[PDB]
Amino acid sequence: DELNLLVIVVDANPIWWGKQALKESQFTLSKCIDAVMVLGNSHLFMNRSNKLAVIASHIQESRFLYPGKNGRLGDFFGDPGNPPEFNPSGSKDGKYELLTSANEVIVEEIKDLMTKSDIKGQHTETLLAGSLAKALCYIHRMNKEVKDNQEMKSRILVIKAAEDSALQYMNFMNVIFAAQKQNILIDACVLDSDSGLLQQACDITGGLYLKVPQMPSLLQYLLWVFLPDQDQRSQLILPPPVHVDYRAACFCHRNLIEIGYVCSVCLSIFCNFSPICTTCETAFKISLPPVLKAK
């Protein structure tokens, strides 16, 4: 009758989660899996014909927790919409049969990722921008097949847990405009680290930049506010209103742009104090720097 989908972006960082347990915390890496155990079950409780998709965010890649990339959930998909070759567990979805198998793949897939973390390469942080690049390619493959009869109303869930690295932040903005064409909604669930790039994904598409206070109070802000139904979110009003506002400034310059000009004719927004070129190989006439420098 109707199917749904929820893409959860888990920021599984062994560096951040490995140091949080030292500060006397009860919500560590072992308890982070319980969030998918509850959200994955409450999503199927409203409709047993739904689908689950969990994507991790490791310091080396964005491993797919469900379905995995191994020989079990890689070539053959364990989705409920495939009765053949999958029915010892995909038959009693109305309780703890298929829901347990959905969490078992996450535990089986994380085994190869936790053991492959020798941290011998100094520090590289988590490539958070590469996590959303894999979610758009997964929701487009299933939409081409389900476009007939059904519609499949889905959303995008992002859980932030750490900062970024030496990655170009321009790649994080390409997934924002690529998702607006499909008329999809992007969320954000920060925990401790704050960034101005993730908040842009909630203002362009019309999402919600929620700030989680304490860690154990996570099941409340992911069930009612981050509901995949997105039918009563316009009149919900539960998280506090957005007070701060972070956007974007200069590209390759150490200043906050507000009236500055680019280098010449390219796209590198710099400043107004530039009579000639800067970091390119172009030129610029002297019919304006003599005017701007005066006043």
Binding site: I15, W16, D164, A166, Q168, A248, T279
Partner: protein
């Protein structure tokens, strides 16, 4: 040809001054220094052990 050359210039000149806007660099170096020195090798073994 000029448009293909200007793409690699902007994409490379930013890697040396990335996240240099506001607190995008102070918060990144704060979590790195809180863990401790990394070239000492002795701390790298305790990170993977946890």
């Amino acid at each position: 040809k000029r448009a293909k050359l200007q793409e690699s210039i902007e994409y490379e000149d930013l890697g040396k001054n990335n996240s240099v806007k506001t607190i995008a660099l102070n918060l990144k170096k704060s979590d790195r220094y809180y863990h401790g020195p990394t070239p000492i090798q002795s701390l790298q073994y305790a990170t993977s052990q946890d």
